[PDB]
Design a protein around this ligand. Structure first.
Ligand SMILES: *[C@H]1O[C@H](CO)[C@H](O)[C@H](O)[C@H]1NC(C)=O
Ligand SMILES: [Mg+2]
Ligand SMILES: [Mg+2]
Ligand SMILES: [Mg+2]
Ligand SMILES: [Mg+2]
Ligand SMILES: [Mg+2]
Ligand SMILES: [Mg+2]
Ligand SMILES: [Mg+2]
Ligand SMILES: [Mg+2]
Ligand SMILES: [Mg+2]
Ligand SMILES: [Mg+2]
Ligand SMILES: [Mg+2]
Ligand SMILES: [Mg+2]
Ligand SMILES: [Mg+2]
Ligand SMILES: [Mg+2]
Ligand SMILES: [Mg+2]
Ligand SMILES: [Mg+2]
Ligand SMILES: [Mg+2]
Ligand SMILES: [Mg+2]
Ligand SMILES: [Mg+2]
Ligand SMILES: [Mg+2]
Ligand SMILES: [Mg+2]
Ligand SMILES: [Mg+2]
Ligand SMILES: [Mg+2]
Ligand SMILES: [Mg+2]
Ligand SMILES: [Mg+2]
Ligand SMILES: [Mg+2]
Ligand SMILES: [Mg+2]
Ligand SMILES: [Mg+2]
Ligand SMILES: [Mg+2]
Ligand SMILES: [Mg+2]
Ligand SMILES: [Mg+2]
Ligand SMILES: [Mg+2]
Ligand SMILES: [Mg+2]
Ligand SMILES: [Mg+2]
Ligand SMILES: [Mg+2]
Ligand SMILES: [Mg+2]
Ligand SMILES: [Mg+2]
Ligand SMILES: [Mg+2]
Ligand SMILES: [Mg+2]
Ligand SMILES: [Mg+2]
Ligand SMILES: [Mg+2]
Ligand SMILES: [Mg+2]
Ligand SMILES: [Mg+2]
Ligand SMILES: [Mg+2]
Ligand SMILES: [Mg+2]
Ligand SMILES: [Mg+2]
Ligand SMILES: [Mg+2]
Ligand SMILES: [Mg+2]
Ligand SMILES: [Mg+2]
Ligand SMILES: [Mg+2]
Ligand SMILES: [Mg+2]
Ligand SMILES: [Mg+2]
Ligand SMILES: [Mg+2]
Ligand SMILES: [Mg+2]
Ligand SMILES: [Mg+2]
Ligand SMILES: [Mg+2]
Ligand SMILES: [Mg+2]
Ligand SMILES: [Mg+2]
Ligand SMILES: [Mg+2]
Ligand SMILES: [Mg+2]
Ligand SMILES: [Mg+2]
Ligand SMILES: [Mg+2]
Lengths: 46, 102, 93, 77, 19, 62
RNA sequence: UAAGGUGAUAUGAACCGUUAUAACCGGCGAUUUCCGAAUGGGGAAACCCAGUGUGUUUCGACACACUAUCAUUAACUGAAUCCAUAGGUUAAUGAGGCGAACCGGGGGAACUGAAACAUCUAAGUACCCCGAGGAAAAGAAAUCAACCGAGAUUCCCCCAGUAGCGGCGAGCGAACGGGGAGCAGCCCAGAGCCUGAAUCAGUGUGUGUGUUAGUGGAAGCGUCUGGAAAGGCGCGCGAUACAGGGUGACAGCCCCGUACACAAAAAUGCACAUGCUGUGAGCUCGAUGAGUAGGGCGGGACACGUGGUAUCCUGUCUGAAUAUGGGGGGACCAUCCUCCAAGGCUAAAUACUCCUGACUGACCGAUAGUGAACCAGUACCGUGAGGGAAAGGCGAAAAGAAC
RNA sequence: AGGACCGAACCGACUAAUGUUGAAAAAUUAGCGGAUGACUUGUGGCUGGGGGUGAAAGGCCAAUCAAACCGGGAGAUAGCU
RNA sequence: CGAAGGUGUGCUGUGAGGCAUGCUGGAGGUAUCAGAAGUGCGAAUGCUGACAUAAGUAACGAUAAAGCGGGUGAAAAGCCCGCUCGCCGGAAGACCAAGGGUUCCUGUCCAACGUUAAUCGGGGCAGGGUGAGUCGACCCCUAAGGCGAGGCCGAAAGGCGUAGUCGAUGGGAAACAGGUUAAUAUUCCUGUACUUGGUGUUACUGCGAAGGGGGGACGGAGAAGGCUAUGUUGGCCGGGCG
RNA sequence: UACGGUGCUGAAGCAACAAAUGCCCUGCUUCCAGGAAAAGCCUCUAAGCAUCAGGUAACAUCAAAUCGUACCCCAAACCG
């Protein structure tokens, strides 16, 4: 059966990537939360 | 400064080798000193192909806590404590209970 | 024209392997480890100036570092650039 | 935004109150009108978005005085 | 201890309906 | 080498940098090849390049 | 500051140093790739692609610098359109983003309680948003009081769960006055005289005193048990030092400290002193904040739910008197008292702790205490926001077991 | 010519058996329907939660849907066990 | 000259308990009288870790299928080599994109991983390996759509959108055959090509854009002819005489 | 022959027939549901530049960077 995760690096980066996060204030708040928590990987970009 | 140094002739205050006198070969940063013919151990050396051909139960000196050896005054013939003075610029070391520079 | 200071920082080591040995005795070619930011032009300038040989064409590739394990702690070796440097008919290195 | 350029009147929030005193949030919007004002200094028409109250302030103080206050606060017209 | 329980999975038979 | 190279001019110190960088290339070649037991030479020259580049900035004005 | 050093797992290798250029520690400099506000344009962050101007070219090219946006200001220029204005270009200065809490403002729930529920409550709470500072805000009476008086603001303890408010239910809940902490008053709405005289701010320059490395720092031996002594036993000694830590078992005197006494080439904080620059005191006369106060309508805030409801704010429509005047004293009127709105500034007492140092605990001691004593916001899970572990102890010494 | 006919790929899912701690959190096997169309499929894009989208089944919106998921109000409340 | 803890034993009190002591353990413990509580567990389909039971039971993942000889090895149904057998062959072969990221090749090892053994492996360890003017990306160009100087709009946050600027799944220059590595090849080598731009020389000369026009540039279905890939047969050549 | 694979030489290399869903064909015929865009490219001039720049052709020389390239890919390497 076709499962839900059908990987595409382009879609991944555009939907969740660093620049996508930076584009909106809510996205920048995601980065702020993740830095505050001290995540080693802020976004999928890596 | 360090009260016990390299080349200093010391006497052991505590341990299996108490009363025995030796010269300090080197001082480790962990407040420990190697004193020749003092804290002997029997190391079971593995057979190395490259450096040192044989194995053999090697007899070598183990580090002893620097606070377990005192400087040997030589004159009095017993353990002494080291103090610090200034005798024309340089910082020197002197014995306690007599007061003579090393 | 490229500065000698830059030409002294692009050649890291000669690459030693069977393919490098074969290339040096078959297609008069020397295999060099080079700086990852070095260009074909900079390699062709550096070999000519530092080894005093005549270079025909530089071929380059980037070697991706391997993921190695050291005491159940995952690590990655650095990517490096490999230069296949073809010399002329009779030069020798 | 719905802000009077003269006075600075803007939407304020209050309640609708029914007979049974049910409080639902509403806004009170200013009585805003885009109006062309004639100035006797710059021989030109100035279009200000102004409340009806703001138009009475211009009638009282004069357009010259009011435009001076806009420049003081740093509001482009 | 006990592992986290599974989300619902397919069931072979309908529960009998008593009514 | 902090007082010695300070007596030199910019026109005598650049050539000195073009002797060290060249020496660092020769040592880097010898080290990779399998030659050079004296591995400490790599650090001496790397730090010597640093000293020379440091004085160049002082001679410049900064 | 120094006889030892080249950070850790982690040895080894090659070395450096031992009286001063080893290393280490501190001040001040230098260097400081790429991404990121990211700012030369772009972009799927750590990449792609330029323009311009210098300088170098071995003519293949190479190096360095600058080029975002917005605001303000200035210069130059410049439409419809005559003047002009808009617009355009260039320069200068500033801004931008991040950060725990505290602070002011703009918006603003519901669960819940009311033993249902709608007024009410929860609550101006959570949350979102904007802005600021080391604090913020507030602040120099159009304040209270009660015919006696007080004298800006803020915070604390009372007043008091009182007076009130309240489907008079559930609940909500003052003030006056008193005791404290702290205390400070000023300026513009203006012209002249006299002069730049008070005082807060930068600015160097001296003076002390802190901070950022450090220096000296007392006094114990014998014997017994033991693997080992710091323990037992005996006899001494220091104490402005018996805080604490370490050392082969429990050490004032073995070590590091501790009390105590000293220390700065360099940078910097604070407080005085003294030049420089700006700032303008004092006296006389005058002035005294209008689409404002007040009102009608609709809301909101006041403990106060419109009530008999003062007072405050204003979305809407109106609209005075302006000192011979005006505001308030809880409907309202008279009398009396008290104050002077419609301009602004202002330290202290107050709030908070992402972070730094010291010290403390009838706090925890590995299922506890942080989620995390351990390479943990990791592994792992999830498209993502996000979720999120487990896992400490050989020995005094590796003497980590040759053969 | 054709939402024409038979029939592979391809798309689907009518019946039966199996499987039901499966080979599989929806399948396998044998048959079955459509198969030039209102077809099917790759890549990328857009629509967001009382909102979307729906040839309409309250279907579908990441194995979740008569109001997604994650964090927060939050230790909601629980005359019940 | 042996603390806590652990584990036996004896004694003792009405009970919760207490005391003594052998063994273990190897450094703590703490009377009395007060003081303070994270102060006592069998249940909460409690929580975490450990370990049972069923049970050496079910099962070992397509019923395409194996047999033997030799080799290596401590050991071979499973590895290597050989012969035979069987299975797929519009695939169960080959080459890619997407996605993964070293799984590739070589040597070495067999704890764990592999539903068995394993000498084997996509497993461990080490070393190697990816070569481009022409392939693709980047790049030029746009689609849907995104972002968007000014701008319009909106309590704030923001929304929309102009000039622009991004955005392929589409348009845009050029390389082929043969050979070669353990592992790359239109990339290396050999042979033979081609494209675009810069510079210089020579001759001849209207060049010049952000503008105009052309072109690029496009549907479904159907039909037929001409072809090639490709196959078949004959000839040809080499070998064969079972 | 290290039984893995290197070195060396080399015959014929034609024809007929069949034939695609590939090519001619972005064609042709036909139908209604009427079938991207922009650049490269070609051409035209404007401002401007005038025996200059620039354009065309031939010849010579130089440049074409950077990143991907292993391997699996209907699968034991991707999603389960
Ligand atoms: C299994 O039970 C669920 C309910 O839990 C559904 O009814 C489902 O349809 C059942 N399936 C079968 C095969 O009966
Ligand atoms: Mg080549
Ligand atoms: Mg390449
Ligand atoms: Mg349990
Ligand atoms: Mg940018
Ligand atoms: Mg940039
Ligand atoms: Mg661009
Ligand atoms: Mg800021
Ligand atoms: Mg209720
Ligand atoms: Mg109730
Ligand atoms: Mg203030
Ligand atoms: Mg009075
Ligand atoms: Mg000291
Ligand atoms: Mg001392
Ligand atoms: Mg003793
Ligand atoms: Mg012990
Ligand atoms: Mg007044
Ligand atoms: Mg009013
Ligand atoms: Mg009134
Ligand atoms: Mg009033
Ligand atoms: Mg009144
Ligand atoms: Mg009254
Ligand atoms: Mg824990
Ligand atoms: Mg424990
Ligand atoms: Mg992931
Ligand atoms: Mg049909
Ligand atoms: Mg269906
Ligand atoms: Mg079927
Ligand atoms: Mg049919
Ligand atoms: Mg059919
Ligand atoms: Mg229904
Ligand atoms: Mg679903
Ligand atoms: Mg609901
Ligand atoms: Mg609550
Ligand atoms: Mg609860
Ligand atoms: Mg204890
Ligand atoms: Mg006690
Ligand atoms: Mg308890
Ligand atoms: Mg229990
Ligand atoms: Mg019980
Ligand atoms: Mg079990
Ligand atoms: Mg059974
Ligand atoms: Mg059975
Ligand atoms: Mg069975
Ligand atoms: Mg099987
Ligand atoms: Mg066999
Ligand atoms: Mg075995
Ligand atoms: Mg088999
Ligand atoms: Mg076989
Ligand atoms: Mg691997
Ligand atoms: Mg393999
Ligand atoms: Mg096994
Ligand atoms: Mg492997
Ligand atoms: Mg568009
Ligand atoms: Mg804008
Ligand atoms: Mg937009
Ligand atoms: Mg573009
Ligand atoms: Mg494409
Ligand atoms: Mg291959
Ligand atoms: Mg043919
Ligand atoms: Mg067909
Ligand atoms: Mg390949
Ligand atoms: Mg499979």
């Amino acid at each position: 059966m076709k499962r839900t995760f059908q990987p595409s690096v382009l879609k991944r980066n555009r939907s969740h990537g660093f620049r996508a996060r930076m584009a909106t204030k809510n996205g920048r708040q995601v980065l702020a939360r993740r830095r505050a928590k001290g995540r080693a990987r802020l976004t999928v970009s890596k | 400064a360090a009260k016990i140094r390299r080349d200093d002739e010391v006497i052991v205050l505590t341990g299996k080798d108490k009363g025995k006198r030796g010269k300090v070969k080197n001082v480790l940063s962990s407040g420990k000193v190697i004193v020749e013919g003092i804290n002997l151990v029997k190391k079971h050396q593995k057979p190395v192909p490259a450096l040192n051909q044989p194995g053999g139960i090697v007899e070598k000196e183990a580090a002893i806590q620097v606070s377990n050896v005192a400087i040997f005054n030589a004159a009095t013939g017993k353990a002494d404590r080291v103090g610090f003075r200034f005798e024309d610029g340089k910082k020197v070391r002197f014995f306690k209970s007599n007061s003579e520079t090393i | 024209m490229i500065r000698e200071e830059r030409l002294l920082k692009v050649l890291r080591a000669p690459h030693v392997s069977e393919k490098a040995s074969t290339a040096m005795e078959k297609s008069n070619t020397i295999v060099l480890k080079v700086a990852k930011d070095a260009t074909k032009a900079e390699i062709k300038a550096a070999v000519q100036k530092l080894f005093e040989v005549e270079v025909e064409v530089v071929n380059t590739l980037v070697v991706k570092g391997k993921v190695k394990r050291h005491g159940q702690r995952i690590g990655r070796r650095s990517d490096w650039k490999k230069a296949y440097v073809t010399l002329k008919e009779g030069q020798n290195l | 935004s719905r802000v009077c350029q003269v006075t600075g009147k803007r939407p304020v929030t209050g309640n609708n109150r029914s007979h049974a005193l049910n409080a639902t949030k509403r806004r009170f919007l200013p009585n805003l009108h885009s109006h062309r004002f004639w100035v006797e200094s710059e021989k030109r028409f100035v279009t200000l978005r102004v409340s009806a109250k703001g138009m009475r302030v211009i009638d009282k103080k004069g357009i010259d005085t009011v435009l001076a206050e806009l420049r003081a606060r740093g509001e482009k017209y | 201890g006990k592992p986290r329980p599974y989300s619902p999975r397919p069931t072979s038979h309908p529960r009998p309906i008593r009514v | 080498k902090a007082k010695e190279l300070r007596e030199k001019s910019v026109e005598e110190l650049n050539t000195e940098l073009l002797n060290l960088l060249r020496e660092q290339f020769n040592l880097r070649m010898q080290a990779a090849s399998g030659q050079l037991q004296q591995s400490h030479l790599l650090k001496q020259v790397r730090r010597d390049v640093a000293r020379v580049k440091t004085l160049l900035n002082e001679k410049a004005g900064a």
